[PDB]
Amino acid sequence: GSNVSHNFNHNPFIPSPNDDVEITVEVEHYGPIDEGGIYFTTDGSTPAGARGEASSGEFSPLEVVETKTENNLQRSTLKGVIPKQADSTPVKYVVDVWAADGEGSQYADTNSLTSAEATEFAYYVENYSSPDWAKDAVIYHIFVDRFFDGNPDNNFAVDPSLSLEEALKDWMGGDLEGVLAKLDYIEELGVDTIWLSPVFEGPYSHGYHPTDFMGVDPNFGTLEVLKELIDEAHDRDMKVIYDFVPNHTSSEHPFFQDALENGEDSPYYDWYTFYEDGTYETFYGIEELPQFNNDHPEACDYMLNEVVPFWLEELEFDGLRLDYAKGPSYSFWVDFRDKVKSIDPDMYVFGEVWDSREKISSCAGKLDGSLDFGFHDTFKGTFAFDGSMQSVVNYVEENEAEYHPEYIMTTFLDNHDLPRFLYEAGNNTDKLKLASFTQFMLPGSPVIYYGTEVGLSQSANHHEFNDWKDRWYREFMIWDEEEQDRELLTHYQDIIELRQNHSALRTGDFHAHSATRDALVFERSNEDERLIVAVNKGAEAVLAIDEELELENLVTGERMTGDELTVGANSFAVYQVVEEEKDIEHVALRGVHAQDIALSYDEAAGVWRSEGIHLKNKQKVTFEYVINGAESTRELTFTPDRGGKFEFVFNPVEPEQVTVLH
Amino acid sequence: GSNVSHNFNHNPFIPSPNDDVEITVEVEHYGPIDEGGIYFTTDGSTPAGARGEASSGEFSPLEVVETKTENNLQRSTLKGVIPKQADSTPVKYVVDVWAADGEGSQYADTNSLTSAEATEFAYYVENYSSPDWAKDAVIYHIFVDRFFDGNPDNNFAVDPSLSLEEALKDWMGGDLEGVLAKLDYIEELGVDTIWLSPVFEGPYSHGYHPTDFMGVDPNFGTLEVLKELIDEAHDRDMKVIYDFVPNHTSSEHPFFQDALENGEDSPYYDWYTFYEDGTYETFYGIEELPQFNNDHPEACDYMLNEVVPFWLEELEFDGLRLDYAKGPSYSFWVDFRDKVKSIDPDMYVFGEVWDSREKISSCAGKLDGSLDFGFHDTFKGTFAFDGSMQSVVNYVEENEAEYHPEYIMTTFLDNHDLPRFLYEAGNNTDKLKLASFTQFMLPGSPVIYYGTEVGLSQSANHHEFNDWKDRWYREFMIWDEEEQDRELLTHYQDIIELRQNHSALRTGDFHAHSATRDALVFERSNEDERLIVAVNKGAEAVLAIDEELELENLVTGERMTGDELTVGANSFAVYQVVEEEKDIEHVALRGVHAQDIALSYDEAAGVWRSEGIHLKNKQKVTFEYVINGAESTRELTFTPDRGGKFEFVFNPVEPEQVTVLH
Ligand SMILES: [Ca+2]
Ligand SMILES: [Ca+2]
Ligand SMILES: [Ca+2]
Ligand SMILES: [Ca+2]
C-alpha cells in the first residue's frame, strides 16, 4: 500500500529523563495517508496498537508535517513525540500509518498490516554513563583453552596423539585453574581487567557453541574454581569480564533438541525461529548454530532473569563482552541494559559489533561501548602493512566526531578471529613495539591478546588453509622464559605503567600537530597535565609542532625546549610538557540573562552547574561559558521543548557539549 | 550464509552484438566463498544452475578478483563474463556464489539457496535504437471518455441524473466514434501522434482495470470503430499510440474469478501471485487490482504471444504506452522488446516509470523511452509556482548526462493523474504560454493533454477531496468556440508549426548561455541550422549571450545584430541565427595508426565510418576525429575486450560518443 520507514529516527537518540522524544516517519505512498500513531510502552510489555487504538501501551499521534508529489508518487512526513519518561525506563514503541476514512493500517519499516509483524523500536531513558573504571581499564583478553593447564585432570577431550594442525582446532587443556596460577604474571603485566574466553558447556574448545548458558564446561573446571579465580582476582583490585554469547546456541543444546523432536508441543519451540518447512533461523547459515530467539517473551525472560544474573550476580563478574551484539534486537538490549545496570551500574557491558562506526553508534545508549574494529583495520594497514599515519589520525578524529563521549571503544591489535599482528608485520617486533606504544598513547581502552607481550605469533600461514584458519591465532601461550620475547614483555610493562600513571593518556583530548606517512606527532590534553607523543615507523624526519614549549622524555628523564623535534627512525617517545596552567577557579554564564551568571562547582562530579533558570518552550537560547574572566566557550544554542526550570552544566573536559540538563 | 549482491551490474548495460558482458558481483560473507557462476540462457527459457552445473543454459564462472576483511566480515568481489551474442537476442541469467569444498550454494540479490527463488537478470543484445518518428513526434494524449461523444447509443453506463462531482469519476460517454469525428481538429492542431487512453473492457471509465486484455469495452465502441479510427488516422500520416496496462487486472477479470474459486485446479492460479493465507500480490494494496504475474511462463506467453500482437499487429497500432512499467520485471521487458521489435522495429514502446531518472535509466535498452516526470515536477514549480529557470536548465543538463541518446523522454505539463497546469498557475494563461513555448523549444517529445490548448482546467479544488481527486484533471473537452480559449489554441498551433519545421528544435543539442530566476536564454545546435530561445516569466531584463551574431525572430520576420538582448516581461521569442557554416566535407582519424585515416561518409545513416582496423584485446587505444582539417574531437579512449577487426564510427550529432562498433 505504501512504504512506511521510521528506522529508529527518534530525535534524542540517547534520551535524558527530561526531554521528550520526537518520532519522525517518512512514508512513500500512492493512495492517501492522513495520520499515523505511536503505541509505546513503559514496562517490559510488548507494545501494540492499530489506527489510534493501542492494545498494550499509550497512544501518541503521527501528523503530516510535510508532503508533496514526486514522480507520480506522494511523499509525506509524519511526526509525533513520546512524552518524557522517568530515569531507568525502557521505552518500546511500534509505529503505523493509515488513511483517515480508509480501511486498515500499515506499520513501520516492515510495511506490515498488523502490529505483530512490525518493527519494534526501543530506547532507554537514562542519564547515559559508562563505568568510570572501564574508561581507564587495560584488558588482558585470554583464550582459556590456550593459556595455562593448571590441572591436567580436567582434560577430558584433549587427545595428545594429535598434531599441531589437528590440536589447534580441538581441545588443548587450558583451564581456569591455570589462570589462577598465572595470576601473578597477569598482575605483573600491569593490567587491571581480565577478559575471559567463553566457558560454556559446549562441543568446541572456544566455547561459542553453548549447550548450557548457566553451566561451566568441565574441560575448563568448576564454578568454584571460577568463583575462586574471580575472588582472587578481586582481592588484587583487578576486574574480570566474561565473554558472553547471547545470540545463539548449538544444535546440541537440550532446548533445541527437545524442540527438534517434540515440535510445537515443546516448551522451547518458540525460543528459536523455526520455519514452516523445517528450516530455522541460524548464524550465517551454520545449521549447527541456531539463532536463539531473544525477541520471544519467554526466552527474553530466560536470558535476562535467569542467565545474565547467574554470571553477573551469582558468579560476581564485573562485566560482559557480548559475542555478536548485532544478532539480538535493540529492544532486547534496552531490556538488557535495564537488567544489568539495575544489578550494579558499574558493570561493564560492551559488545562485538561487526559493522561500520556509523552503525556501532546505534548501540550507544544501550551498551557501555564496543570493540574498535576500525582501530584494528586501520592499524594493521599502517603499522603491519606500511600505510600512512594519517589513517591513524583519520581514525581517531572520526571517533570523536561520531561516538558519544561516554561510549568506550576498546582497542586491540589481534583477536581470536583475526591474524596476529606480529605475523602480519613479518615478525618485525619493532613494528609491534610502535603499534603497542601508539595504542597505549591513544584514547580508548587497550586490550592485549594473551600472547602478544611475549612475541606469540603464528606457527603457520592462514592463507594456506580453509574454514579453520583461526588455528594459528589461538596457539598456546609460551612460558619458557628462553622462548619468550622478554624485550617485548618489558616493553608492554613499561607502556602500561606510563598510561596507568598519566590520566591524560587515558581520558584526555586528542590533538594532532604534524603527521606524514610513517611519521606522526600529537598531544593529549587534560586539566592536570599535557603530553606530546612522537612516533615514526620509517626514516628519521622532522615534524612541526604548533607552539614552542619545553618537554620531558618520560622514559629518560631529560628535557628539550624547542618548536620542532627530530623523531628517530623506527623509534618513538612521549614527552610531558611543563606548564603552570592556572586551573579553573571561576566559571560564568554569558548569554541567557542580562548579566553574567556565575556558576558553582560540583566536587562529586567535575562540572560547573547553574542554579535554576526558567525557559520558554522552543525558545532559541544562545549563550557561552567564560573561564576565569579570560577565554570563553564559542557560542552554543539550545531549545527547551518541554518545561521551564532547566539547569546549565559545564563539563570542562567536554566544554562544547550543550548539556542544558534539567 | 552471506550477502550476494549483483543488482543488474553488467558492464555493457546496453550490449551490442559484439561486446562481451562483464558480470561483477559483490559478496559480504562470514565463512568462505571461493567461486560462483553464471547460468545464462539465449532462448526464452528460464535460466537455472547450481555450483557450476547449469540446469537450463550455459555456464560461466565467477572468480574472486578482490577480497579483504573489514570489521570482522570478509568482502570479496566476483567477476565473470557472458560471451557475446548475436543481434536481437534475449539473455536471461541467474548468479550464485558458493565455497569450494563446501556444502550448498547461495544466489544473487535474494540470497536464496535455490535457483528458483533467485533474482533473474536480463538484458537485450541489439544495436539499441528508438523509432526515428518517435523522436520528432508531437503527441495529443486524449482521455477517451472525456473527449467527444460521437455516438450516444454506446453510453450504457452513463447516468445523466448525476452531478458533476459524481459523474467525473463515472462514465460520461466519450467514445472512439468521437475521436473519428474530431479527427480534423486534432490534425489542424498539428500533432503527428495520438495517444489513446485505455479502452479495455473494465468496470471503470478510465480503463485501467482490464477484465479483457484483448477486448474493447462497448462503452467506447467496437474494434471496427477502432480499426476505422486507426486507419483514418493513418491515411492522414498520423501515428496512434495505445495506453497499455500489462501489470494488473481487476478482481472482476474472468481469470482472477476462476482462480479465486477453483484454487490450484484453475488454469490461472499461477497467473497471479496467490499467497498461502488467501492474500495475493496487488497494486499498492488495492484488493481490486491484483498484480498479473508476468514472471509466470504461461502468463508471459499469454501477454506476449496473444495480447500484445492483438493491439500492435491485428489492430495495427503504431506503439504502446505502458502503464506502470515498474511492475513487471526487466526479464519481462527484455522478452517484451524482442516481441514488439520483431513485429516492426518502428513500433514506439515507452513506459510510465514512477521513479528518479537514475532508475528510469535502467529501462533503457528495453524500452524506447519514458515519460519525463522530472520535466513535469520541475516545470510546475518553475512556471506555475514561480521558481528558478535554473531548475529548468538543471533538468535539461542532467537528462543529457544520464540518459542514453536513443532514449526518448516524452515531456508533458499535465496528466490524467496530476493537476492541470492552468489551475496550478492560477488560470494565468500567460504562464501556460511560457511553459508550452519553452517545452516545444526544448529537447524531447512534447505531449499535449487533450484539453490544454483551449484552456480546459479544473472546475473545483482537488485538495478539498480525497481518493477521487483526479475528477478535475479528467473534465470534458470544451467544443463551444465561445467557451474555448482560441488565443491559447492559436498559440499551440504556432508553437507546433515552429518545432515541426525546425529539426534543431526536435533533435538538436542544447546549450544554455545566460539564465537567472524568471529569465533564460539558450540555443539549439544542429548541423543544418541554429536557433536562440529567450523566455522570461518576470520583469524585463538583459541576459548575456556568449558570442555576437545577428538573429531573426521566426514569428516577426525581423533581424537583430548584437551581443546581448533585452527579453521582455512575461514574453518569449525564438531567434534563428544566420551562419554560412561550411558543412562536413572530410573526417579523418588521428591516433590509431601512424598517419591519419580518412573516413568515408554513409548516406543511409548520418555517420562517418572507418574501413576495418585490427586491435589487440584490452589495448588502451586513444584517438580523435578531425573535421575538414580544422577542429578536432577531444581525445577519446577504447579497449576492445574481444576480437580484432573493429570499426570506428563518427556520429557528428554525438561526436564524443566512443562508438568503436565492430
Ligand atoms: Ca563468533
Ligand atoms: Ca571456524
Ligand atoms: Ca495507474
Ligand atoms: Ca482513484
mmCIF file of N, CA, C and O in Angstrom, chain A residues 213 244-249 272 282-284 289-294 303 323-329 332-333:
data_model
loop_
_atom_site.group_PDB
_atom_site.id
_atom_site.type_symbol
_atom_site.label_atom_id
_atom_site.label_comp_id
_atom_site.label_asym_id
_atom_site.label_seq_id
_atom_site.Cartn_x
_atom_site.Cartn_y
_atom_site.Cartn_z
ATOM 1 N N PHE A 213 23.691 -22.313 29.098
ATOM 2 C CA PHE A 213 24.019 -20.906 29.311
ATOM 3 C C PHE A 213 24.524 -20.649 30.723
ATOM 4 O O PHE A 213 25.281 -19.697 30.949
ATOM 5 N N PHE A 244 30.432 -13.243 26.639
ATOM 6 C CA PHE A 244 29.067 -13.745 26.711
ATOM 7 C C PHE A 244 28.498 -13.972 25.315
ATOM 8 O O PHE A 244 28.671 -13.141 24.418
ATOM 9 N N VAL A 245 27.810 -15.097 25.143
ATOM 10 C CA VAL A 245 27.242 -15.488 23.852
ATOM 11 C C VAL A 245 25.723 -15.557 23.971
ATOM 12 O O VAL A 245 25.176 -16.614 24.323
ATOM 13 N N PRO A 246 25.003 -14.467 23.687
ATOM 14 C CA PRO A 246 23.549 -14.467 23.888
ATOM 15 C C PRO A 246 22.738 -14.760 22.633
ATOM 16 O O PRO A 246 21.536 -15.032 22.729
ATOM 17 N N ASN A 247 23.368 -14.709 21.456
ATOM 18 C CA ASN A 247 22.610 -14.759 20.208
ATOM 19 C C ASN A 247 22.185 -16.174 19.834
ATOM 20 O O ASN A 247 21.091 -16.368 19.291
ATOM 21 N N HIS A 248 23.027 -17.171 20.095
ATOM 22 C CA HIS A 248 22.791 -18.494 19.540
ATOM 23 C C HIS A 248 23.287 -19.568 20.496
ATOM 24 O O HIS A 248 24.124 -19.321 21.367
ATOM 25 N N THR A 249 22.748 -20.769 20.317
ATOM 26 C CA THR A 249 23.221 -21.981 20.970
ATOM 27 C C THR A 249 23.766 -22.924 19.899
ATOM 28 O O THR A 249 23.865 -22.571 18.721
ATOM 29 N N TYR A 272 13.329 -20.628 19.509
ATOM 30 C CA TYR A 272 14.066 -20.487 18.266
ATOM 31 C C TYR A 272 13.094 -20.043 17.181
ATOM 32 O O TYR A 272 11.875 -20.041 17.370
ATOM 33 N N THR A 282 19.417 -19.211 11.697
ATOM 34 C CA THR A 282 20.733 -19.660 12.120
ATOM 35 C C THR A 282 21.730 -18.518 11.990
ATOM 36 O O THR A 282 21.420 -17.445 11.465
ATOM 37 N N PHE A 283 22.943 -18.767 12.477
ATOM 38 C CA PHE A 283 24.026 -17.787 12.445
ATOM 39 C C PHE A 283 24.833 -18.002 11.170
ATOM 40 O O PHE A 283 25.686 -18.890 11.104
ATOM 41 N N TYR A 284 24.553 -17.184 10.153
ATOM 42 C CA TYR A 284 25.276 -17.212 8.879
ATOM 43 C C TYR A 284 25.207 -18.591 8.223
ATOM 44 O O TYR A 284 26.209 -19.135 7.751
ATOM 45 N N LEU A 289 24.494 -23.786 14.466
ATOM 46 C CA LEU A 289 24.382 -22.590 15.300
ATOM 47 C C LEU A 289 23.008 -21.962 15.104
ATOM 48 O O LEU A 289 22.873 -20.924 14.444
ATOM 49 N N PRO A 290 21.963 -22.565 15.669
ATOM 50 C CA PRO A 290 20.628 -21.968 15.555
ATOM 51 C C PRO A 290 20.523 -20.698 16.385
ATOM 52 O O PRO A 290 20.994 -20.636 17.523
ATOM 53 N N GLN A 291 19.897 -19.680 15.802
ATOM 54 C CA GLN A 291 19.786 -18.385 16.462
ATOM 55 C C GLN A 291 18.771 -18.457 17.597
ATOM 56 O O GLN A 291 17.594 -18.760 17.371
ATOM 57 N N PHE A 292 19.229 -18.184 18.817
ATOM 58 C CA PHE A 292 18.330 -18.122 19.962
ATOM 59 C C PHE A 292 17.447 -16.886 19.851
ATOM 60 O O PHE A 292 17.944 -15.764 19.711
ATOM 61 N N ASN A 293 16.133 -17.091 19.908
ATOM 62 C CA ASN A 293 15.163 -16.023 19.662
ATOM 63 C C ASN A 293 14.983 -15.204 20.934
ATOM 64 O O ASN A 293 14.116 -15.482 21.765
ATOM 65 N N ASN A 294 15.807 -14.165 21.082
ATOM 66 C CA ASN A 294 15.684 -13.270 22.226
ATOM 67 C C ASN A 294 14.486 -12.338 22.119
ATOM 68 O O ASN A 294 14.156 -11.668 23.103
ATOM 69 N N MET A 303 16.887 -15.346 29.366
ATOM 70 C CA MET A 303 18.212 -14.753 29.228
ATOM 71 C C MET A 303 18.456 -13.682 30.282
ATOM 72 O O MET A 303 19.558 -13.584 30.832
ATOM 73 N N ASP A 323 29.258 -11.441 22.512
ATOM 74 C CA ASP A 323 29.578 -12.006 21.207
ATOM 75 C C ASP A 323 28.433 -11.749 20.234
ATOM 76 O O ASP A 323 27.299 -12.184 20.468
ATOM 77 N N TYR A 324 28.735 -11.040 19.144
ATOM 78 C CA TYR A 324 27.779 -10.721 18.084
ATOM 79 C C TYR A 324 26.561 -9.985 18.652
ATOM 80 O O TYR A 324 25.454 -10.518 18.757
ATOM 81 N N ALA A 325 26.805 -8.724 19.017
ATOM 82 C CA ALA A 325 25.744 -7.866 19.527
ATOM 83 C C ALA A 325 24.765 -7.437 18.443
ATOM 84 O O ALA A 325 23.730 -6.845 18.768
ATOM 85 N N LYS A 326 25.066 -7.713 17.173
ATOM 86 C CA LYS A 326 24.147 -7.373 16.093
ATOM 87 C C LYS A 326 22.980 -8.345 16.010
ATOM 88 O O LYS A 326 21.912 -7.980 15.503
ATOM 89 N N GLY A 327 23.168 -9.576 16.486
ATOM 90 C CA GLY A 327 22.148 -10.597 16.437
ATOM 91 C C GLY A 327 20.850 -10.175 17.094
ATOM 92 O O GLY A 327 19.818 -10.018 16.434
ATOM 93 N N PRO A 328 20.877 -9.983 18.413
ATOM 94 C CA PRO A 328 19.670 -9.537 19.115
ATOM 95 C C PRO A 328 19.219 -8.160 18.647
ATOM 96 O O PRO A 328 19.959 -7.412 18.004
ATOM 97 N N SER A 329 17.974 -7.832 18.981
ATOM 98 C CA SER A 329 17.385 -6.560 18.599
ATOM 99 C C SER A 329 17.805 -5.458 19.569
ATOM 100 O O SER A 329 18.336 -5.712 20.654
ATOM 101 N N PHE A 332 15.856 -5.747 22.629
ATOM 102 C CA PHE A 332 16.419 -6.674 23.603
ATOM 103 C C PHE A 332 17.508 -6.009 24.434
ATOM 104 O O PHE A 332 17.559 -6.196 25.656
ATOM 105 N N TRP A 333 18.386 -5.233 23.791
ATOM 106 C CA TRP A 333 19.471 -4.587 24.521
ATOM 107 C C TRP A 333 18.954 -3.513 25.468
ATOM 108 O O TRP A 333 19.569 -3.262 26.511
#
